[PDB]
Every structure is written in C-alpha cells, then in structure tokens.
Design an enzyme around this catalytic site. Structure first.
Site, PDB file in Angstrom:
ATOM      1  CG  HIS A  61    -106.120  17.588  29.615  1.00 58.47           C
ATOM      2  ND1 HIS A  61    -107.711  16.866  28.462  1.00 58.47           N
ATOM      3  CD2 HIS A  61    -105.909  18.837  29.482  1.00 58.47           C
ATOM      4  CE1 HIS A  61    -107.561  17.882  27.427  1.00 58.47           C
ATOM      5  NE2 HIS A  61    -106.706  19.435  28.065  1.00 58.47           N
ATOM      6  CG  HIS A  91    -103.667  24.302  30.766  1.00 58.86           C
ATOM      7  ND1 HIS A  91    -103.793  25.116  29.895  1.00 58.86           N
ATOM      8  CD2 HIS A  91    -102.908  23.375  31.361  1.00 58.86           C
ATOM      9  CE1 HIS A  91    -102.169  24.573  29.307  1.00 58.86           C
ATOM     10  NE2 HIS A  91    -101.499  23.692  30.097  1.00 58.86           N
ATOM     11  CG  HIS A  93     -99.749  20.942  34.125  1.00 58.37           C
ATOM     12  ND1 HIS A  93    -100.156  20.048  32.894  1.00 58.37           N
ATOM     13  CD2 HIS A  93     -99.345  21.778  32.956  1.00 58.37           C
ATOM     14  CE1 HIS A  93     -99.943  20.238  31.532  1.00 58.37           C
ATOM     15  NE2 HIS A  93     -99.666  21.858  31.571  1.00 58.37           N
ATOM     16  CD  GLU A 103     -96.851  19.725  32.256  1.00 56.25           C
ATOM     17  OE1 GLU A 103     -96.941  21.032  31.396  1.00 56.25           O
ATOM     18  OE2 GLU A 103     -97.582  18.424  32.028  1.00 56.25           O
ATOM     19  CG  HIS A 116     -97.915  25.164  31.360  1.00 51.22           C
ATOM     20  ND1 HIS A 116     -98.511  24.381  31.077  1.00 51.22           N
ATOM     21  CD2 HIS A 116     -97.081  25.740  31.905  1.00 51.22           C
ATOM     22  CE1 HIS A 116     -96.881  23.841  31.664  1.00 51.22           C
ATOM     23  NE2 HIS A 116     -96.856  24.831  31.806  1.00 51.22           N
ATOM     24  CB  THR A 196     -96.480  19.468  27.966  1.00 46.53           C
ATOM     25  OG1 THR A 196     -98.157  20.427  28.955  1.00 46.53           O
ATOM     26  CG2 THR A 196     -95.606  21.225  28.435  1.00 46.53           C
TER      27      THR A 196
HETATM   28  N1  L8N Z   1     -99.947  22.411  28.348  1.00 48.02           N
HETATM   29  S1  L8N Z   1     -99.208  23.255  27.665  1.00 48.02           S
HETATM   30  O1  L8N Z   1     -97.872  22.855  26.520  1.00 48.02           O
HETATM   31  O2  L8N Z   1     -99.902  24.630  27.613  1.00 48.02           O
HETATM   32  C1  L8N Z   1    -101.065  23.156  25.779  1.00 48.02           C
HETATM   33  C2  L8N Z   1    -101.156  21.465  25.713  1.00 48.02           C
HETATM   34  C3  L8N Z   1    -102.536  21.482  24.638  1.00 48.02           C
HETATM   35  C4  L8N Z   1    -102.856  22.561  24.393  1.00 48.02           C
HETATM   36  O3  L8N Z   1    -103.477  22.779  22.878  1.00 48.02           O
HETATM   37  P1  L8N Z   1    -105.394  21.777  23.377  1.00 48.02           P
HETATM   38  O4  L8N Z   1    -106.131  22.812  24.203  1.00 48.02           O
HETATM   39  O5  L8N Z   1    -105.048  20.948  23.736  1.00 48.02           O
HETATM   40  C5  L8N Z   1    -105.773  21.407  21.581  1.00 48.02           C
HETATM   41  C6  L8N Z   1    -104.905  21.112  20.546  1.00 48.02           C
HETATM   42  C7  L8N Z   1    -105.232  21.261  19.488  1.00 48.02           C
HETATM   43  C8  L8N Z   1    -106.645  22.074  19.079  1.00 48.02           C
HETATM   44  C9  L8N Z   1    -106.572  22.362  19.795  1.00 48.02           C
HETATM   45  C10 L8N Z   1    -107.172  22.674  21.306  1.00 48.02           C
HETATM   46  C11 L8N Z   1    -102.751  24.159  24.613  1.00 48.02           C
HETATM   47  C12 L8N Z   1    -101.168  24.453  25.613  1.00 48.02           C
HETATM   48 ZN    ZN Z   2     -99.960  22.820  30.286  1.00 48.21          ZN
END
Ligand code: L8N
Ligand code: ZN
Length: 259
Positions: A61, A91, A93, A103, A116, A196
């Site tokens: 992703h 990371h 987008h 975003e 982010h 997000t």
């Molecule tokens: N794009 S954003 O909003 O910065 C984001 C979105 C999801 C995130 O968590 P994630 O890395 O998908 C995850 C979730 C639950 C357990 C392990 C890992 C982190 C940042």
């Molecule tokens: Zn993000």
C-alpha cells in the site's frame, strides 16, 4: 480485502470497516480561514536521531521506513501533545499525475505527495497496536511534498526504491535521519482524526505542517515506479494510494499561526 483499485478503493472501505463513516475520520480539507489560532499550544519539537532507521519495505500500500522505537530517542513532543510519542515508521501517499496524491488538502488544494511520520504513545501503551486503538494513542505528522528542486537527502531514499519495487520486499535502510525530510518551519494545523488506511481507527492526533518540502520530478517518478503487485503478477503501478477528504463533522482545526 482493501486497496486503491476500482473495486477495493476508499469509496468501498466502509463495507468492511464501518468506522470509515465515523465522526473523526481523516484526512480532511483544511480551510485555512476557518482554522482557530491557538497560542496556548506548546512549540512542536521533532527530536530525531540520525541512526534509528531499520529498513525500507514495499507493503503493497506504500513504501514504509521502520524505526527502532524501544526507547524515547526519536520523538515528537509539544504542540497539542501532552507528552512524547515515539516514531515507529514513516511512509508516503502520492498520485499518478502531478497535481494529486496528498491525502490532506488545503483550501481544496492537493499536493503530489504527503509524508506521514507515525508516532505512538509508548509511555501509556505497551504496543503500537494497542496505542492504535485509543483516542490518545497516536500522533501523525503530515508533511506535504511539492515538485521543484531536487531534495539531496531524498536521493538516499529514492535510490533505494528499485530494490523494493515489488510488493512484499524489503531492504536494510540504516542511518536515515527523518529530520532531513522536514521543512524549516514548525508551524502546523492540528485536529483529532483517524488512520487513513484500515482499520481507520480514530486514534490519531494529526499534526499537518504548514510548509511543504520540495523534491524533483525525477525523485517523484521513482515513487511512481513502485508496484502494488508482487514479482509474478501483471504489473500495476503503485500510484493514487491516497484516501480523499472526509467530513469534518464539527471538529475544530487549530493552527499554531495566524493565516
Ligand atoms: N496513513 S496513516 O494515517 O499515517 C496510518 C494508517 C495506519 C497505520 O497503522 P498500521 O501500520 O496499518 C497498523 C495498524 C494496526 C496494527 C499494526 C499496524 C499507521 C498510520
Ligand atoms: Zn499515511
């Protein structure tokens, strides 16, 4: 079961994660004139060390750089936060074409990419996953990227993308200081919001920096050369990996400065 394609993109996420339609979803359109100047906020500090990075990974992703977060040496503090949040990962987008990909938007304007830097409240929660379930669990600093002059520090990262072009690959990525991706201003907007990407949990204090950094078109092109797909699939380029603005639902956006 989710992605950024025509069948599994952001418009359909709610079918799997109902919180997609919640009261604190991210990102948002920041209407600068409607943000509330909040002078009581503390100064935002990003205290980042030079050699806490571990690896760079194409997770299907985005491309993500993970950090050693077992102590409090790479932290965000101040602004709206009540104490330090440790950097777990950053990371990006970005878009297919030059004028979309961020975003957050400002006054309706998008940027080609958004970085982010993802921080968690390790003083309160025992794991990133635990923090990611709680309203006060995470602090994500958002940095807009525009295209312009080549960013020297960015070269290290854009040069690394070839080896992680296919989904599910990773490489070692040592001594990359995320401070090198920050603008010279620490002015920001802050609001209570969500992840997000699924599970879209409303656990994030959003800190979107007012000033964008700039990278070259060549550098932006290296991100577009990543793929959503693995080594043995038909190639689909990783582009348009962003969720659009979600309803504000009467949330207050504060600003560290007057517009
Ligand atoms: N794009 S954003 O909003 O910065 C984001 C979105 C999801 C995130 O968590 P994630 O890395 O998908 C995850 C979730 C639950 C357990 C392990 C890992 C982190 C940042
Ligand atoms: Zn993000």
């Amino acid at each position: 079961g989710w992605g950024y394609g025509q069948d599994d993109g952001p418009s359909h996420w709610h079918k799997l994660y109902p919180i997609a339609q919640g009261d604190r979803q991210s990102p948002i359109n920041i209407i600068s004139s409607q943000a509330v100047y909040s002078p009581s906020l503390q100064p935002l500090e990003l205290s980042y060390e030079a050699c806490m990075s571990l690896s760079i990974t194409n997770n299907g992703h985005s491309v993500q750089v993970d950090f050693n977060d077992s102590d409090d040496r790479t932290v965000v503090t101040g602004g709206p936060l009540e104490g330090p949040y440790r950097l777990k990962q950053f990371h990006f987008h970005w878009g297919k074409k030059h004028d979309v990909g961020s975003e957050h938007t400002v006054d309706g304007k998008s940027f080609p990419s958004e970085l982010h830097l993802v921080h968690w409240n390790a003083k309160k929660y025992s794991t990133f996953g635990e923090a990611a379930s709680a309203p006060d669990g995470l602090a994500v600093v958002g940095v807009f990227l525009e295209t312009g002059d080549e960013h020297p520090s960015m070269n290290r990262l854009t040069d690394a993308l070839y080896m992680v072009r296919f989904k599910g690959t990773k490489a070692q990525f040592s001594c990359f200081n995320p401070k090198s991706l920050l603008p010279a201003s620490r002015h920001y907007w802050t609001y209570p919001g969500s992840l997000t990407t699924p599970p879209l949990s409303e656990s994030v204090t959003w800190i979107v920096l007012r000033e964008p950094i700039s990278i070259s078109e060549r550098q932006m092109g290296k991100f577009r050369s990543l793929l959503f797909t693995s080594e043995d699939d038909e190639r689909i380029h990783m582009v348009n990996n962003f969720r659009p603005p979600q309803p504000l639902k009467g949330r207050v956006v504060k600003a560290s400065f007057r517009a």
